[PDB]
């Protein structure tokens, strides 16, 4: 503890020096620091460094980077209430001729990137948990579209780092062929396949967003946003957006359930047609 404290004091008391570097990284906590601090600490503890291991001192609370024995350079990371301080000490941090300064700078940059990614992931997880617990899609979690707008402590998040544009991209995408009987539903312009999918997914569909559902995987505890669209040969195109790659619960089981519902609807329609002894199409 006292050696790390002295190194941090020397780094802070020598700004702009070629041997000591101090960097401050803010933690954009959408839900506040009370819940974000524990998540950030856990992520930092579970964070992995290339060729280095982070040891957290319990007396001081500041993590130190060591070779995985102390290396030729000292890297110290301090986690405050709402900011992260990274201190790097080396003989020459400016020279990059295969020395310890270049390695220390690369390690500091990697640690800063990992901390930023961890903060973003914590914010996304908090937003997903709030959406799952409230069945409402926040603007920061996903931007409100024109259809959603027509059918419609986060103030700092709105007046902070750009929200809405940080929504997770479509992790997986699939196209499901729609049968000829289900191509036209009971309402003009509404496919029967779309209606069946809505009826199936009403258990997790978003009220404020049309044809949108929020599904939380049981294994990964990750809430993902599913969007379904009709593509014309009418078909159902489903895009699943999540922080990480979609698991097998949504990739396979959900597709199987949707296919089973579509097949049941087609079989019921065919039975109704045969009840009237109507001519059956070769596709039917």
- Which residues, 6+ apart, have CB-to-CB distance to 9 below 8 Å? none
3-class SS string, the chain: CHHHHHHHHHHHCCCCCCCEEEEEEECCCCCCHHHHHHHHHHHHHHCCECCEEEEECCCCCEEEEEECCCCCCEEEEEECCCEEEEEEECCCCCCCCCCHHHHHHHHHHHHHHHHHHHHHHHHHHHHHHHHHHHCCCCCCCCCCCHHHHHHCCCHHHHCCCCCCCCCCCEEEEEEEECCCCCCCCCCCCCCHHHHHHHHHHCCCECCCCCCEEEEECCCCCCEEEEEEEEECCCEEEEEEECCCCCCHHHHHHHHHHHHHHHHHHHHHHHHHHHHCCCCCCCCC
List Cα–Cα distances, 15 to 38, 56, 103, 112, 249, in angstroms. Answer: 30, 25, 20, 19, 52
Contact criterion met (CB below 8 Å) for 167 and 142: yes
CA distance 87 to 13: 11
- Please state, in angstroms and as integers, the Cα–Cα distance from residue 73 to each residue in 2, 49, 100, following that order: 17, 15, 6
CA distances from 243 to 118, 164, 246, 262 (A): 12, 14, 9, 29
Neighbours of 231 (CB within 10 A): 11
Question: String of b and e for 47-81 (b: at least 16 CB within 10 Å)?
Answer: bebeebebeeeeebebbbbeeeeebebbbbbbbee
Resolution in Å equals 3.2
Residues 6+ apart with CB under 8 A from 131: 137, 138, 141, 214, 223
Q: Which of 18, 14, 43, 58 is nearest to 111 (CA)?
A: 43
CA angle 113, 116, 119 (to 5 degrees): 150
Closest CA to 104 of 18, 40, 27: 18
Cα separation, 58 vs 130, whole angstroms: 32
Contact call for residues 91 and 102 (beta carbons, < 8 A): no
Distance between CA atoms of residues 227 and 241, nearest Å: 8
CA distance 237 to 197: 11
From residue 41, alpha-carbon distances to 17, 56, 66, 114, 122 in Å are 29, 10, 18, 12, 11
Phi, psi angles (nearest 5°) of residue 101: -65, -45
Q: Which residues contact 269 (CB under 8 A, 6 or more apart)?
A: 181, 182, 192
Provide the experimental method for this PDB entry: cryo-EM
Q: Report the chain's terminal Cα–Cα distance, integer Å.
A: 76
- Among residues 107, 104, 102, 60, the alpha carbon closest in space to that of 79 is found at 60
> Distance between CA 126 and CA 36 in Å, rounded?
9
Measure the CA–CA gap between 119 and 20, rounded to whole angstroms. 26
Give CA–CA dist 41/241, Å, rounded: 27
């Amino acid at each position: 503890s006292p050696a790390l404290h002295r190194a941090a004091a020397h780094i802070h008391s020598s700004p702009g020096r070629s041997t000591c570097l101090r960097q401050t990284l803010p933690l954009s906590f959408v839900f506040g620091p009370e819940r974000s601090l524990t998540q950030f600490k856990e992520e930092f503890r579970r964070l992995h460094l290339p060729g280095h291991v982070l040891l957290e001192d319990p007396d001081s609370g500041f993590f130190f980077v060591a070779a995985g024995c102390l290396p030729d350079f000292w890297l110290i990371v301090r986690v405050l209430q709402d900011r992260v301080e990274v201190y790097a000490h080396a003989r020459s941090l400016i020279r990059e001729d295969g020395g310890p300064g270049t390695e220390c700078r690369h390690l500091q940059q990697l640690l800063v990137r990992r901390v930023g990614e961890i903060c973003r992931e914590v914010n996304q997880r908090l937003l997903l948990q709030d959406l799952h617990d409230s069945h409402v899609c926040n603007s920061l979690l996903v931007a409100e579209s024109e259809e959603d707008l027509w059918r419609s402590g986060y103030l700092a998040a709105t007046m902070q780092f750009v929200p809405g544009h940080f929504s997770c991209d479509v992790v997986w995408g699939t196209v499901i062929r729609v049968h000829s009987r289900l191509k036209m539903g009971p309402s003009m312009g509404v496919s029967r396949a779309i209606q069946a999918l809505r009826s199936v997914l009403n258990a997790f569909s978003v009220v404020n967003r049309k044809n949108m559902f929020v599904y939380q995987e049981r294994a990964t505890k990750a809430v993902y946003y599913l969007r379904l669209l009709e593509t014309s040969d009418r078909h159902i195109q489903l895009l699943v957006h999540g922080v990480g790659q979609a698991g097998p619960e949504i990739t396979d089981e959900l597709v199987r359930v949707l296919c089973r519902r579509l097949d049941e609807a087609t079989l019921d329609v065919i039975t109704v047609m045969l009840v009237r002894n109507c001519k059956l199409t070769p596709a039917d």
